[PDB]
Amino acid sequence: PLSTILALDLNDNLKSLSNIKYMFKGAPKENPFGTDKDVYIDTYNLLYWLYLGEDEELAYPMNINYFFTEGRFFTIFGKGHKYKVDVSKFIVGDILFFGRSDTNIGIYVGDGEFISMMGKFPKDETPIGKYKLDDYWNEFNGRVMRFDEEVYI
């Protein structure tokens, strides 16, 4: 699948993407992968740049309103419920939401982990990294989504 392959590529190249930094709503005009210079990018723009490398384009800045009506996704689990036993049933590439108001999102990877940027709010210098799901399981919020390209347009 496209999403799984992209997630595996990101995991393989995760250590080499230290140039990408964390910011609240970073929306740079330069592709992080096509430049060695450091650049501040958030999770939504990171996903947009990751999916723009292939033929898919999506849209910019790809805020929370993108998922509501664009039809690019179909929900797997709804918000409001939180089960720790069903986490194993998920697959790589699924988008994981965080925060009570959709403050941040993430990409699921195997072995009970997820890829996202975490740090202090006022433009932290910490680069992208991978964190265990146990400590962040509290703020998972239960929302899960998945991609689909074959039927769209």
Binding site: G99, R100, E139
Partner: protein, 65 residues
């Protein structure tokens, strides 16, 4: 459940709404995309932040039916 159940959510005859919650979050809206908000938790900090251009009206979850 107290986080979501305890929410005095009301909508005026104007489509701009008023929102209160058991938590520190409390959102009020006016004409256009203008709004007033307050919060204390660091997790809910983006809801009532002013970084760069400030939080967008669409970012708030209470702004959706």
């Amino acid at each position: 459940v107290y986080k979501y159940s305890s929410s005095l959510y009301e909508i005026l005859p104007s489509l701009n709404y008023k929102y209160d919650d058991g938590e520190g979050t409390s959102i009020r809206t006016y004409n256009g995309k203008s709004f007033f908000s307050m919060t204390s938790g660091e997790e809910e900090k983006p809801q009532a932040t002013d970084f760069y251009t400030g939080t967008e009206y669409q970012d708030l979850f209470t702004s959706y039916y």
